[PDB]
Structure 1
Amino acid sequence: KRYFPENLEQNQSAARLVSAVKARASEADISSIHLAIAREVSPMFNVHE
């Protein structure tokens, strides 16, 4: 992972930020990612939420 700049993750005053990003940053998976790309072009029939 390359979520943070050098030193910032181990930084103690960065902790709330690091927790926020980590709360957002899901692990990479080929399937979810390919899906995210593919559904940009795929027709939608049930409205997305």
Structure 2
Amino acid sequence: KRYFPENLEQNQSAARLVSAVKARASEADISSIHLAIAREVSPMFNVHE
């Protein structure tokens, strides 16, 4: 992973932002990413939420 610049992850001022980023970022499922790509051209029948 490389969500942060060097040093910043361990920086004390930054802790709030890193808890935010780590909360948003997830483990990379290749499945959900290929899926996210294919959904971009796939016809939509059921409505996405």
State TM-score, norm by structure 1: 0.94
- Gaps spanning 5+ residues in structure 2: where? none
Cα RMSD (Å) = 0.6
Mapped to 2, the partners of 1:5 and 1:33 lie a distance apart of 24
Aligned length: 49
- Gaps spanning 5+ residues in structure 1: where? none
| Same amino acid, percent of matched pairs | 100
Which structure would you say has the larger RCO, counting Cα contacts within 8 Å and 6 or more residues apart? 1
Q: Which has the higher helix share?
A: 2
Runs of 4 or more above 6 Å deviation: none
State TM-score, norm by structure 2: 0.94
